[PDB]
């Protein structure tokens, strides 16, 4: 018997999921962060965030199509994390690292928080 | 500065497979000669040109049940579905032709090209 391990398969799947997101194909939720809105696939959000995982495994919240995050959450920080979920790349700047880290803590993304700590 | 998480995509895919096995947010059942396989349309579209076409077709994109061609082998489909969700393609001498035929039907040409190396 034989097993072939396609080493860029997962990356290729994730790129295609990001392309679906950019085209708004099969997205099933909007995340509202104060004045800004971001469409996504619940499966990707649950895969990456303990907060979204907990929301969408609640039987009474699984069908929510609109999520309003806490008013204190920074939209730019959320956008950076959403892009990370769909690309594997976390793009930080001196002016936004604190907001990214705070948003990652709120989203229960502990490994991203740990990375952010390294950049002050 | 950009931090590249080199195992992030694999970690996402594993979590998507865990959601599949727990039947969380799956939105379609694929029927192959009366055998049923639940899945996420997004993953099927990401991996297969046929499913990409089906799930954007205005006449089929809202169906929760998709019936494949009656000549499609259920074992071959299961092998390809597992590959979609894990990156691992398992081949045996007794099923490689069925796997290859199923990949051709699903418009997964890169998988077909790999199977050809083992013939």
């Amino acid at each position: 018997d034989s097993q072939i391990q396609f080493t860029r398969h997962a990356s290729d799947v994730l790129l295609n999921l990001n392309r679906l997101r950019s085209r708004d194909i099969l997205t099933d939720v909007v995340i509202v962060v104060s004045r800004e809105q971001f469409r996504a696939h619940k499966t990707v959000l649950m895969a990456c965030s303990g907060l979204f995982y907990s929301i969408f495994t609640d039987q009474l919240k699984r069908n929510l199509s609109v999520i309003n995050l806490d008013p204190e959450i920074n939209p730019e920080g959320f956008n950076i994390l959403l892009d990370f979920m769909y690309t594997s790349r976390l793009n930080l700047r001196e002016g936004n690292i604190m907001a990214v880290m705070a948003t990652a803590m709120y989203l229960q993304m502990e490994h991203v928080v740990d990375t952010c700590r390294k950049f002050i | 500065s950009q931090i590249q998480f080199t195992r992030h995509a694999s970690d996402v895919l594993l979590n998507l497979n865990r959601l599949r096995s727990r039947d969380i947010l799956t939105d379609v059942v694929i029927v192959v000669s009366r055998e049923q396989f639940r899945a996420h349309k997004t993953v099927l579209m990401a991996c297969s040109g046929l499913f990409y076409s089906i799930f954007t077709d205005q006449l089929k994109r809202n169906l929760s049940v998709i019936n494949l061609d009656p000549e499609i082998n259920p074992e071959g489909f299961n092998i390809l579905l597992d590959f979609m969700y894990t990156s691992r393609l398992n081949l045996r001498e007794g099923n490689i032709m069925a796997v290859m035929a199923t990949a051709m039907y699903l418009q997964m040409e890169h998988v077909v090209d790999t199977c050809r190396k083992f013939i």
Binding site: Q3, L15, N16, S22 | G49
Partner: peptide, 16 residues
């Protein structure tokens, strides 16, 4: 079991 890595693209690319 013979395990082999394949490093090429595994699936189609969805256009932007």
């Amino acid at each position: 079991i013979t395990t082999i890595k394949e490093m090429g693209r595994s699936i189609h690319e969805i256009p932007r």
